[PDB]
C-alpha cells in the first residue's frame, strides 16, 4: 500500500474536520496507509518553486472550497476543477430518512423530545448579530419550531436572547412558538444524522457547509463572520424569480446584517420550491467524482 501523510494544526474545527474526514476515506475506500499528523488538540488511520505522499518517519521531518480553478494546490471546487463525499453517504442518507423508527431512535438517543408538528431546525454558526431577529421571528410564528443547538459559539447570544441564566448541555426552553434546545458535541457521523433529521440546517465554515449540501434539506450558510455571492451564482440557477429573490435575501441577511425576520418569512412562502431545490443540488453535485478519488487517480497517473 502507498504511504500518505496529512498534517493539520488549527479558529478551531474545520481544519481537523476536513483532514479527519479525508484520512478515513483514503483508508476505507482506497486501501491506503495514511497517518494524520495533527499538530493541535471508524479508523485504521495512524493519527513553491515550479498532504505528503513517499514514506519517511524522521523526527526533523524536513527530510523530504471557495481564482480557485487557477490555484491547483488544494484543488477543491464546485466545477470540473471536487468535494469530500463518501461512496455510501447518499445511500446511507436515504435509508435513514425513509425509516421512521431510525429517525425516532437517534432523536431519542440525544435527549430530544420532538415537538409534534414542529419545524426542526439545526443551527451551528459563529456569533451572528441577527440571531435575535431570527429567534423573534420563530417565536412569533403561528406554527411551532424546535431548534437544536449543539455546544458552540452560538449559545452565548442564545442566552442573551432568552435573558435567563447560562445555558449548557441539556437545557431546553420554550418562548411562544419556538422551543430552544442545547445539544452536546457528538460524533461526526451523528452530526450527519442530525442534518438528515431536521427540515432546515444552518451550518458554517467548510465541512458542515458541504455536509448539509449532501443532506439535501433547505440550508443556510455562515461564512467566517466576498465568497458568499460566488456560491449563490451556481446555487440559485433553477429557482423562479420569487424563490430566487427569497433565497438571496435569506443568505445575505445571515451574513450582512439584514433583517432575519423578513427574509425567513419570505423564504417560507416558497418552501416546496426550496425543498426540491436543495434535493436537486445534492444530486447534481454528487454526479461528479469526489475529492478523495480526485486525489488518488491524479497520483496514479503521476502528473
Ligand atoms: C456541531 C458539530 C460539528 N461537527 C464537525 C463538523 C465539521 O466536521 C467540523 C466543523 O468544521 P467546519 O464545518 O468547517 O466549520 P468551522 O467554522 O469549525 O471551520 C472553519 O473555521 C473558520 C474559522 C474558518 O473558515 C476555517 O478555520 C474553517 O476551518 O465539526 C461535529 O463533528 N459534531 C458537531 O456536533
Author numbering: 2 to 11, 13 to 43, 53 to 58, 73 to 75, 85 to 87, 89 to 99, 127 to 128, 132 to 146, ...
What does the paper say about this structure?
The recently discovered arginine rhamnosylation activates the polyproline-specific bacterial translation elongation factor EF-P. EF-P is rhamnosylated on arginine 32 by the glycosyltransferase EarP. Rhamnosylation is mediated by the recently discovered inverting glycosyltransferase EarP, which utilizes dTDP-beta-l-rhamnose (TDP-Rha) as donor substrate, resulting in α-rhamnosyl-arginine on the acceptor EF-P. Unlike with the common and relatively well understood glycosylation of asparagine, sugar modifications on the guanidino group of arginine appear to be rare, and almost nothing is known about the molecular mechanism. The enzyme is composed of two opposing domains with Rossmann folds, thus constituting a B pattern-type glycosyltransferase (GT-B). While dTDP-β-l-rhamnose is located within a highly conserved pocket of the C-domain, EarP recognizes the KOW-like N-domain of EF-P. Based on our data, we propose a structural model for arginine glycosylation by EarP.
We were able to subsequently confirm the GT-B fold by having solved the crystal structure of EarPPpu at 2.3-Å resolution (Data Set S2). Indeed, the EarPPpu C-domain includes residues 184 to 361 and follows the Rossmann fold topology, with six β-strands (β8 to β13) and seven α-helices (α8 to α14). On the other hand, the N-domain (aa 1 to 153 and 362 to 377) could only be built in part. Yet, the structure has a higher-than-usual R-free (35.1%) value at this resolution, which cannot be explained by a simple absence of disordered regions. This is likely due to the N-domain adopting different conformations in different unit cells, causing crystal disorder. Similarly, TDP-Rha in the EarPPpu crystal structure is located in a binding pocket that is composed of residues located in the C-domain. F191EarP, F252EarP, and F258EarP side chains form an aromatic cage that stacks against the base of the nucleotide moiety of TDP-Rha. The sugar ring of the nucleotide is then specifically recognized by a hydrogen bond between the hydroxyl group on C3′ of the sugar and the side chain of Q255EarP. The diphosphate is recognized by hydrogen bonds formed with the side chain guanidine of R271EarP, the Y193EarP side chain hydroxyl, and backbone amides of E273EarP and D274EarP. The binding pocket is closed by the bulky side chain of Y193EarP, which may sterically ensure proper positioning of the rhamnose sugar. The rhamnose sugar itself does not seem to make any contact with the protein and is solvent exposed.
